[PDB]
Amino acid sequence: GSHMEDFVRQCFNPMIVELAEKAMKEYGEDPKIETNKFAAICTHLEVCFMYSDGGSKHRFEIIEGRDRIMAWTVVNSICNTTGVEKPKFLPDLYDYKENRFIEIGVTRREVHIYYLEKANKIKSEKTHIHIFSFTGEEMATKADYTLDEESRARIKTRLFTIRQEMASRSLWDSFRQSE
Amino acid sequence: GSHMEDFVRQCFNPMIVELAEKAMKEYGEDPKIETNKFAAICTHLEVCFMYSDGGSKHRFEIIEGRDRIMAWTVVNSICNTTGVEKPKFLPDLYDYKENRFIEIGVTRREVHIYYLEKANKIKSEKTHIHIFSFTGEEMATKADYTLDEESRARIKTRLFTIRQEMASRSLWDSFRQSE
Amino acid sequence: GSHMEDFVRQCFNPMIVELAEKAMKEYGEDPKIETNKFAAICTHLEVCFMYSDGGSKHRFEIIEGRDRIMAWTVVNSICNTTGVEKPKFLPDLYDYKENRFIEIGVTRREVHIYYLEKANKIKSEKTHIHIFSFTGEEMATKADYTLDEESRARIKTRLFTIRQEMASRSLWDSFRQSE
Amino acid sequence: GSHMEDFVRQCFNPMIVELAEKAMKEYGEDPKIETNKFAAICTHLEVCFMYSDGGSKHRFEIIEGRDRIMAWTVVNSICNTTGVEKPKFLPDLYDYKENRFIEIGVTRREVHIYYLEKANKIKSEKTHIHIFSFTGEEMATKADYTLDEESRARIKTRLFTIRQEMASRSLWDSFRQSE
Amino acid sequence: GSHMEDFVRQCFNPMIVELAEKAMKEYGEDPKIETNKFAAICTHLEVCFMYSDGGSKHRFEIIEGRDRIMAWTVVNSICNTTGVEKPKFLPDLYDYKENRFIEIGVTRREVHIYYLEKANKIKSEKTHIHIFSFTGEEMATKADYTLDEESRARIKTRLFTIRQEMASRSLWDSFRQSE
Amino acid sequence: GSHMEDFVRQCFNPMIVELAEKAMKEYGEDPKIETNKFAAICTHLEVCFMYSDGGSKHRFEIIEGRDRIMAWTVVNSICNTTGVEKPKFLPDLYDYKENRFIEIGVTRREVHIYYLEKANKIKSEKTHIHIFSFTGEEMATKADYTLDEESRARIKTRLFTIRQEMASRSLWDSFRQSE
Amino acid sequence: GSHMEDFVRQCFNPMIVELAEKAMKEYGEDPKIETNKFAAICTHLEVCFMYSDGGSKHRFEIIEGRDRIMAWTVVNSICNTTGVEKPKFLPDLYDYKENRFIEIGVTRREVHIYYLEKANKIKSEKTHIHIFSFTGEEMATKADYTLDEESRARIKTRLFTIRQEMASRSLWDSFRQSE
Amino acid sequence: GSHMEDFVRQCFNPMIVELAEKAMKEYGEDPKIETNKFAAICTHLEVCFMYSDGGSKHRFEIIEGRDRIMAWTVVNSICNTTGVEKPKFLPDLYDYKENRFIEIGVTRREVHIYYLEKANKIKSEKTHIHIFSFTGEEMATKADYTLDEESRARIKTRLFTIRQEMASRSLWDSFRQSE
Ligand SMILES: [Mn+2]
Ligand SMILES: [Mn+2]
Ligand SMILES: [Mn+2]
Ligand SMILES: [Mn+2]
Ligand SMILES: [Mn+2]
Ligand SMILES: [Mn+2]
Ligand SMILES: [Mn+2]
Ligand SMILES: [Mn+2]
Ligand SMILES: [Mn+2]
Ligand SMILES: [Mn+2]
């Protein structure tokens, strides 16, 4: 029974917490144990949701937060629809405005180290990359940040008020060393 | 008890499935038997709904998915309102922006054969024609596709993820030979 | 027990029917008896609602369908707020975009006779006037129709599909002679 | 058991009344006793809510109506996010469009006396100031009123219809002398 | 704008207040004016509802709170169904357990004076009579109180907590002199 | 467009009206045409629902108002479960308390003629029979009326208030001659 | 930011947690600080709710969890209704079956020490007393436990599964020393 | 993509299907693969739910369908509460009326072979055992079937209508050979 298991349950939305439990258990982890990654994948889920929420009402297509098999199914459908190269690892969104997939990251290092962790794994980085941080910075491909200046500020404000409430419970430092 | 009767029930929205059952029974068919056309008229209904959803909030007027008599009633009302020629077969939508009716098709042939099946039956093609396909192509009158580029991609992505889930159950090939 | 009492109940929205009953009883009439004016004030209510619905989300202020005293209260508040002359009879809407009140009419004569019935009663016609008809015409002050071309077509289409369903029950002719 | 305790309960929205009770009790007052300030902080809450409602869907961030500690938490998060000076007293909103905090006032004096009460207390008035009145005037920093002309008229119309219903119960004069 | 108009709105359930407004206006009175009888018919409605609630789930048939015409319609239906004498004034309930109509009263005199006011008007008192009071007494025909001892205590407790909240606002004495 | 089509829509519950439309169309009839049988099968449905409602919470199993195939499926399941003879025509309910099927009738003749119409068609009347009437009588097998005296009175009261509202619209006499 | 503040939020029902916050703040305490008594008054609230839930549907009258003033108001109403001595400290329930008030306790000592803490403070113990414990014992006046044997077991099972989840987070021992 | 994966999704309640997916994945199985046990644990869940539903409103305590850890937590709480021996394998219910745990089984063999599979594994069969079957038989400890005769018939009727719909799709025989 961890302090942060409770904080994750009380902090995020019940649907997001349920999807995080499902994804973590599908890839072999216990939210009651690997609690730091529990908070991480909750945060990642929420950031992706607010991202797809920013912009037009039906501009994005959510890939993260689905079943493995179904997420892939969507990716193949989009690929055949428009004519984009099938990604290598599962992306997080697809911009219909820019006809391109989007990988969303949330890290505790600088934008540079996280972007480096993601770009080489992307290899053929035919799909866009967008990083966020609990400090407030964001590195994105070709400095195209996709979203409005107001939607992105909302996301970082949220990222930081999470970091605050974690420090109020002396759980922030353990989160910083896990990544 | 057919496999695709279940797949149609689990795949589409309950309202769409109910309207498909109602329309098929009104024109003398059993969704438990003519199952391929069950999936077809479910798909047609859903595509029409997403179409009227794309664009402005109150830009389209749904004609398909109503009672025979009531659908006609609406058509006469629109006709008298604006001043457009009363169609010959029941159309699917009316664009208030373009002051014109719209016939929506979803086929398993090329855009050409379906468009040919529809245009001669339209005779006096005073009303627009718009075709869609499980491959991803679309033929439309005067190459005016009515909707935004992003709303139409959504529709075709959906059409294709349906085709996928059908192949996952070995039901796609039977669908292809029915049309 | 009249045929059109039932048709009015089954045709319009329950809230609109309830507000019509309330207004008619407040001004001394029985919806079970003066049934033609029952259908009339239902239609008037619905047309006003769709009107305030067309345009921006918070562009109009509904005056009809409120309590006598409260409706007036709103009018005084708007008057003091912007600086417009207090109307003489209770108006139906207020356009915040055009800073002007709006009187909405729905008649069975021509636009001319109804507009004449309303303008002289307006006397100091400082407030806008907008007429609608079951035929499909509309006369408005200075030929400024306030709303988009698509929102107004919706209203007239609705007005006409009502006229149809009335004729399907042989109740239209009695409606035409009541005005 | 005061007349205006009832009028406040019947006039405002239950959520707003509950938040007003919570804030007043947190800062040591009884809504059953300091009833004038009960109506005041209800009005202030509602005006702030309509303000954040005017404009874009996610343009503002509500600071008033939260817990003391949580409200501050949000302020620190916004501050770190964009890079604005941390206010001195707790502000009411943050404009993401204009990257600036907003203090909303509702007074019974002129715009001048209220604006004077707020500006010197702001000291380093790095954050915007916006006043409203039951008469209908509004003074704002640099004459930038932030919102559309139609959203602001709505607010003042509401402020005045409240003043009316108060006079209908002979409670307005007691409200005027409390400030 | 009366104090007790507000107290009635804030004290009773919105459906009960709406039905009271409807009945009072149907029999020619203004809840904003004849406010004491407003509170009275609200109380009468609520007492009848709790009465029909006490006992079995489908033991009673509500007659009060319906439209004049419809209430009568129900009475005729019950009369023909069982075989009971058609009442003279409109009763409030029908006990299916005891096969008898019930008239419910709520007074500010003693049980004796109210029971006397009701019995002679009943003339052929073929239907049961049940009185309640803000003091807590109850006179009933043949001392048959119909309901359980626990359901009736609930009703009187409610009647008295209303009398209290009225005294908290100095409105009780005006209520006592109106009857 | 019939008067009673409207009266049926406004009188019964939308679910019951929908199930009646479905059953009538499944057995080849138009509710807009065979309107008398529309009202009949609505009434039959409602009476069956109130019947299964009377008694214990899970005492009855509804057979009428289901799909043909599914209704039969249930019947076979009950038959195998308890050990009762499979009926010949589709029954309406099954009493789990009395381990016996129940056929519910609603007629405009006497209990005798309707009971005679049903018993010979039952042939091997191994299943119970229960008749109801718009007059208020009821004939049942072995004079076992299954339900409480209070639940059955409710049903007949409802049957009669329907007959009243029909006479208020001069539609009752046409109903009486159709059976 | 305490561990048990989170555990209390995630463990109990949001309404109960809100009422506990309200009562604690009304009697001058911070749920973010006096967290042990936060969990205590949450538990007390929940136990009282399940108690009033056990037994008949309308057998009990809830006194705890109301506003101070309103709770008293109810007590006076019950007192006048039945004829019971007005308690000295605010009781928790009133049994309408047994015509007596009930004080509910939940302690971490034995039933004896808690019962002793309550009885002398009751002085004139005209009202019933009922104790519960996280161990599972219960002392009650005259060994009359009021409720069924099954409703009381439910309460103690719940009390103990709370004690378990507290030990899973190493928060139980701090709870035991606070009383 | 299996036929019975679809049939399980369309046949059972979404909550039950979700809990079955969760339990199967927690004990290392894929509902898309071990589909027969998918239908099995769905059926087991539903039978347990109807069982706890039969009888008194709060007579049973559900153990199956919870998290492993939480289910155990409840068991320990009940054990300490009443004083029953802690079971060895996780039971399904606890009867508060009979103060005893209950293991529910649903098999495709005879009651004898399933009861034999369960009793020796129970070893110290201090807890009750209750078997059900798609044929309709039931073996229970000491021939005490716990529930009413009507609630148990409901369960078996449901078990058999499932077996029917499975045969309608030629999936029953594969289910019979899996156990
Ligand atoms: Mn990502
Ligand atoms: Mn089409
Ligand atoms: Mn008008
Ligand atoms: Mn402010
Ligand atoms: Mn009465
Ligand atoms: Mn039948
Ligand atoms: Mn029948
Ligand atoms: Mn207490
Ligand atoms: Mn207590
Ligand atoms: Mn089991």
PDB file of N, CA and C and ligand atoms in Angstrom, chain F residues 44 64 90-92 103-104, ligand 6:
ATOM      1  N   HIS F  44     -52.868  -4.280 -24.615  1.00  0.00           N
ATOM      2  CA  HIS F  44     -52.498  -5.623 -24.208  1.00  0.00           C
ATOM      3  C   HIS F  44     -51.107  -5.634 -23.596  1.00  0.00           C
ATOM      4  N   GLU F  64     -44.675 -11.954 -23.807  1.00  0.00           N
ATOM      5  CA  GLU F  64     -45.128 -10.983 -24.794  1.00  0.00           C
ATOM      6  C   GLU F  64     -44.214  -9.760 -24.792  1.00  0.00           C
ATOM      7  N   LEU F  90     -48.044 -18.939 -28.377  1.00  0.00           N
ATOM      8  CA  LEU F  90     -47.106 -18.252 -27.488  1.00  0.00           C
ATOM      9  C   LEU F  90     -47.824 -17.628 -26.298  1.00  0.00           C
ATOM     10  N   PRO F  91     -47.504 -18.014 -25.071  1.00  0.00           N
ATOM     11  CA  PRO F  91     -48.164 -17.437 -23.895  1.00  0.00           C
ATOM     12  C   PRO F  91     -47.598 -16.046 -23.601  1.00  0.00           C
ATOM     13  N   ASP F  92     -48.175 -15.378 -22.596  1.00  0.00           N
ATOM     14  CA  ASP F  92     -47.760 -14.027 -22.230  1.00  0.00           C
ATOM     15  C   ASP F  92     -46.838 -13.961 -21.024  1.00  0.00           C
ATOM     16  N   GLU F 103     -51.896 -16.826 -20.008  1.00  0.00           N
ATOM     17  CA  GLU F 103     -52.347 -16.094 -21.182  1.00  0.00           C
ATOM     18  C   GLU F 103     -53.271 -14.976 -20.732  1.00  0.00           C
ATOM     19  N   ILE F 104     -52.944 -13.751 -21.128  1.00  0.00           N
ATOM     20  CA  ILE F 104     -53.664 -12.557 -20.713  1.00  0.00           C
ATOM     21  C   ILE F 104     -54.471 -12.059 -21.893  1.00  0.00           C
TER      22      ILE F 104
HETATM   23 MN    MN I   6     -49.238 -12.942 -26.156  1.00  0.00          MN
END
